Design a protein around this ligand. Structure first.
Ligand SMILES: OC[C@H]1O[C@@H](Oc2ccccc2)[C@H](O)[C@@H](O)[C@H]1O
Ligand SMILES: OC[C@H]1O[C@@H](Oc2ccccc2)[C@H](O)[C@@H](O)[C@H]1O
Ligand SMILES: OC[C@H]1O[C@@H](Oc2ccccc2)[C@H](O)[C@@H](O)[C@H]1O
Ligand SMILES: OC[C@H]1O[C@@H](Oc2ccccc2)[C@H](O)[C@@H](O)[C@H]1O
Ligand SMILES: [Ca+2]
Ligand SMILES: [Ca+2]
Ligand SMILES: [Ca+2]
Ligand SMILES: [Ca+2]
Lengths: 121, 121, 121, 121
């Protein structure tokens, strides 16, 4: 299992010790407060009112927690995933990333505390 | 395992099929948007800016997801609990509740979708 | 989870720390060598050649590992149970017992090492 | 998870759908009756009285259930493994094999029914 912090201004994202393999079932739980710029902070679901201006993940709100698995595209994580299986041909190290527009992570603040574990299969 | 919705205006809370027994390890993941009154909506961590005016759970923000286990006091759930063990002498059916002041649930809106499962022990 | 030894000459059986509750999924793995009398020893499946002369469990061979859950009748365990769910209205402490005829445990020898854990549910 | 039969006369062994990956925790439960030649049959622990005459696994009795993981040497399985982690650098498909001397599987009989699952990690 892995636990650690995902910083909102970390554009490269946070690499974890979790390698997703074919057939794996995982659970993620994310908590905390972060901002993509404004003084206000939002949870792992991000800001439902902010327009998408080039987010690294178009299937999640700005300020949401997302992930990449290996060299997959971004996958929404939000508050977490419950006993979750990946799409086919998706595998590799899990990296957690704050959802923001590339080149605009500089003014971000806060972080998400995240737990990841593999479940029974 | 249990999955279902928890309505923000449900003052009595949502009873689940999960009976927490001594020694049990559980995982909860909660998602969605709700409000304790304002047009704005918040995630299961609630509104970090709103003052506590008599919340059923003083250890969580207004609009947060909380729970009771049997006849326990309220316990913060927020975005969820990862492989979580209860305090001693805590057991019984799990009821999920929106965190608001008693008597003020009438103007709430939205809901949280919640997964609960028992883990390896 | 529980791990411990189950002595073949223990007529009362070995009480474990495991309380089976409704809905629980459990895994048991048993290993080792024991005898109901003869110099030969058998594994947790017991002696397939020996006639049943009043075994505490008629659904298992003499010398097999069995269990009671609460005040249930004996249930065959043998080499173990994989992600196993009990019949309805069966619950309580798990006690492991060597399968022999009541009053004839005195000449038994050896033991089984057993692991019991609760599984994801 | 995987369930299936392992034939005693199958010298090449039974390939499973389980790929053991680094970090994986697995549970195996094996049951049934088989023989390496004699009319008598033995459980997954094999025959404790029979001398080793060139067994594919020298750390288990003749007639015992063993396995290979990828290109590993044979690993004793016996009645099963409980929440088990492999040695370092061991990974790949799990193949279950009856422990006998190479070239002598022809007169074997019976089979073991085996369950394999990945556990919480
Ligand atoms: O959409 C992503 C961008 O949102 C801006 O925040 C805004 C706040 C109000 C109006 C427009 C952008 C941030 O300042 C910028 O860094 C980037 O994150
Ligand atoms: O604190 C809990 C209460 O918050 C009020 O909303 C307010 C918003 C701003 C200032 C005071 C109350 C809600 O209108 C009321 O129903 C109750 O939930
Ligand atoms: O059936 C259970 C009994 O089996 C006897 O062993 C026998 C071995 C061969 C034939 C008859 C009894 C044991 O001596 C006795 O203690 C009891 O366990
Ligand atoms: O040790 C492995 C071998 O055991 C023999 O069975 C014997 C039984 C008693 C004495 C010698 C061999 C089998 O006949 C042969 O096929 C092979 O499995
Ligand atoms: Ca920004
Ligand atoms: Ca309200
Ligand atoms: Ca006896
Ligand atoms: Ca043979």
């Amino acid at each position: 299992a892995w636990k650690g912090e995902v910083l909102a201004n970390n554009e490269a994202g946070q690499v974890t010790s979790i390698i997703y393999n074919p057939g794996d079932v995982i659970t993620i739980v994310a908590a905390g407060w972060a901002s993509y710029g404004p003084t206000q902070k939002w949870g792992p679901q991000g800001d439902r009112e902010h327009p998408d201006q080039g987010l690294i993940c178009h299937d999640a709100f700005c300020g949401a927690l997302v992930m990449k698995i290996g060299n997959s595209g971004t996958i929404p994580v939000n508050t977490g995933l419950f006993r979750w299986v990946a799409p086919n041909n998706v595998q590799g190290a899990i990296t957690l990333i704050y959802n923001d527009v590339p080149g605009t992570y500089g003014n971000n603040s806060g972080s998400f505390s995240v737990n990841i574990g593999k479940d029974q299969s």
